[PDB]
Amino acid sequence: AECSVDIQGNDQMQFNTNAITVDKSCKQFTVNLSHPGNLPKCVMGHNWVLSTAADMQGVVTDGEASGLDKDYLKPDDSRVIAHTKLIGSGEKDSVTFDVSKLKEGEQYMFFCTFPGHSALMKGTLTLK
Ligand SMILES: [Cu+2]
């Protein structure tokens, strides 16, 4: 029925949800990210990245190393299934991905690659 969901990353380094469920009927899925708080992109920026759980660490490691002008994401990274832009306070961004590529029942992981956030800003994403 509904293939979208609005998520938030506040100035406390946290997402307002830690688990997403994609409905079996959804052929594509949308996540609209927004940033409540007062802090700037260089201090408390967030993004939304999807990858398999096993790929997370690498994606972060290389992400952080990728630097800011790169939305803390290795450019052209094959491990990234989907991702938004790194956004600062008072901003928003959205991404819509191809569900047919997802493996039903596989618990994927989504998270922010901004330095030091992933440990606390991560969660599951499962296709029902
Ligand atoms: Cu973050």
Swiss-Prot record:
Highest taxon, organism lineage: Bacteria
Keyword Cell inner membrane: no
Key word Ligase present: no
SUPFAM superfamilies the UniProt entry points to: Cupredoxins
Record-annotated membrane-spanning stretches: none
Disulphide bridges, residue numbers: 3-26
Keywords tagged on the record: Copper, Disulfide bond, Electron transport, Metal-binding, Periplasm, Signal, Transport
Binding-site residues for Cu cation, renumbered to this chain: 46, 112, 117, 121
Domain Plastocyanin-like: 1-128
Gene Ontology CC annotations of this record: periplasmic space; plasma membrane
Cell compartment(s), UniProt: Periplasm
InterPro entries, A to Z: Azurin, BlueCu_1, BlueCu_1_BS, Cu-binding_ET, Cupredoxin
GO MF annotations in UniProt: copper ion binding; electron transfer activity; identical protein binding; transition metal ion binding; zinc ion binding
Pfam families, per the entry: Copper-bind
Biological role: Transfers electrons from cytochrome c551 to cytochrome oxidase.
PANTHER family membership: AURACYANIN-B, OUTER MEMBRANE PROTEIN H.8
Listed name of the protein: Azurin
Gene assigned in the entry: azu
